[PDB]
Amino acid sequence: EVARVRNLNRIIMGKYEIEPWYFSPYPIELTDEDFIYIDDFTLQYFGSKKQYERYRKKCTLRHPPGNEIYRDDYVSFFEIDGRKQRTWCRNLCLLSKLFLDHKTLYYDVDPFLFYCMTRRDELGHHLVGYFSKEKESADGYNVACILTLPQYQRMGYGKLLIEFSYELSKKENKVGSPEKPLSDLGLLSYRAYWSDTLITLLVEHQKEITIDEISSMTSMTTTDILHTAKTLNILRYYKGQHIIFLNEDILDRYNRLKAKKRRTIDPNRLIWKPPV
Ligand SMILES: CC(C)(COP(=O)(O)OP(=O)(O)OC[C@H]1O[C@@H](n2cnc3c(N)ncnc32)[C@H](O)[C@@H]1OP(=O)(O)O)[C@@H](O)C(=O)NCCC(=O)NCCS
């Protein structure tokens, strides 16, 4: 007799069988099996396919449990108060931790708002990613953690999540930046977003733009703007203050960007007021 005591080596979520990157503290028994089922609507976890199936038949809504504050032909965003949806949000944090080196205690979700993005097609809503945000951040962080589910990564969804987080800041009349320290993947995604943003402004708005103007239009912090401008070699002094400026390199980058034909967030479709 050999008694196997296995780690969680795969989760089964819809048709996907996904291997975790890191340990997550799912409060489950260790058995001779190395999988659990994650329901793609409720995010509930099950040790057995039969138990999963039993609950799957229950009558449930087929999208995340919050208010739909943005809806276009491609995606929806749902805003969820962690305090009002404790179970679902705890389940979301357990799932997220499988793909993070560290995360704040999964159980305590009350301090957070969760912004969950779905793709909609002929089959309805499919959760593809989220970002969390502190209700009250001492550092003014506009994102706490951000995640695209692995089965959906490298399809452009992460950039949409970032873009949406800044649209909230803009509506709030505040600048913001993601919580640090940031994972390498998280930081490289932000640098690409910040870079594409400055490039797009230079081509579509004005050939020369001040720091104040950029900050007003984007809610990016002075620090993130300057770091991005220096990387692109577009920082100058003109008419008595620092600006970024257009050149041939930027034009070329812009044309390559547009060639990719990627989706963006339409600020006009964000129907939302800050708490006040
Ligand atoms: C950071 C993270 C959210 C990025 O999400 P994502 O959806 O993969 O991001 P995107 O798809 O917008 O961009 C990722 C890459 O895919 C590429 N890509 C996007 N759409 C593509 C397409 N249609 N075809 C090919 N490549 C594409 C992008 O160019 C980018 O490539 P790069 O390596 O040249 O930058 C994701 O890596 C993640 O969830 N990581 C773990 C969570 C984490 O560490 N979070 C930090 C906060 S706690």
Swiss-Prot record:
Ranges spanned by the short sequence motif ESA1-RPD3 motif, renumbered to the chain: 86-107
Active-site residues (renumbered): 179
N6-acetyllysine: residues carrying this PTM: 103
One GO-annotated biological process of the protein: positive regulation of transcription elongation by RNA polymerase II
PTM field: Autoacetylation at Lys-103 is required for proper function.
Catalytic activity of the protein: L-lysyl-[histone] + acetyl-CoA = N(6)-acetyl-L-lysyl-[histone] + CoA + H(+); L-lysyl-[protein] + acetyl-CoA = N(6)-acetyl-L-lysyl-[protein] + CoA + H(+); 2-hydroxyisobutanoyl-CoA + L-lysyl-[protein] = N(6)-(2-hydroxyisobutanoyl)-L-lysyl-[protein] + CoA + H(+); (2E)-butenoyl-CoA + L-lysyl-[protein] = N(6)-(2E)-butenoyl-L-lysyl-[protein] + CoA + H(+)
Transcription regulation as UniProt keyword: yes
Sorted UniProt keywords: Acetylation, Activator, Chromatin regulator, DNA damage, DNA repair, Phosphoprotein, Transcription, Transcription regulation, Transferase
Result after altering residue 145 to S: Strongly reduces HAT activity, but is not lethal (in vivo). Lethal
Resulting phenotype, residue 97 to A: Strongly reduces HAT activity
Residues that, per the record, bind acetyl-CoA: 144-148, 153-159, 183
GO cellular component assignments: chromatin; NuA4 histone acetyltransferase complex; nucleosome; nucleus; piccolo histone acetyltransferase complex
Swiss-Prot/TrEMBL site (Important for catalytic activity) positions: 145
Location of the MYST-type HAT domain: 3-274
Consequence when changing residue 179 to Q: Strongly reduces HAT activity at pH 9.2. Nearly abolishes HAT activity at pH 8.0, but is not lethal (in vivo). Lethal
Domain of life: Eukaryota
Molecular-function GO term, any one: chromatin binding
Effect seen on changing residue 103 to R: Strongly reduces HAT activity
C2HC MYST-type Zn finger ranges: 36-61
Further facts: Present with 1170 molecules/cell in log phase SD medium.
Function: Catalytic component of the NuA4 histone acetyltransferase (HAT), a multiprotein complex involved in epigenetic transcriptional activation of selected genes principally by acetylation of nucleosomal histones H4, H3, H2B, H2A and H2A variant H2A.Z. Acetylates histone H4 to form H4K5ac, H4K8ac, H4K12ac and H4K16ac, histone H3 to form H3K14ac, histone H2B to form H2BK16ac, histone H2A to form H2AK4ac and H2AK7ac, and histone variant H2A.Z to form H2A.ZK14ac. Acetylation of histones gives a specific tag for epigenetic transcription initiation and elongation.
Oligomeric and partner information: Component of the NuA4 histone acetyltransferase complex composed of at least ACT1, ARP4, EAF3, EAF5, EAF6, EAF7, EPL1, ESA1, SWC4, TRA1, VID21, YAF9 and YNG2. The complex interacts with histones H4 (HHF1 and HHF2), H3 (HHT1 and HHT2) and H2A (HTA1 and HTA2).
Similarity section: Belongs to the MYST (SAS/MOZ) family.
Protein name (record): Histone acetyltransferase ESA1
Protein species of origin: Saccharomyces cerevisiae (strain ATCC 204508 / S288c) (Baker's yeast)
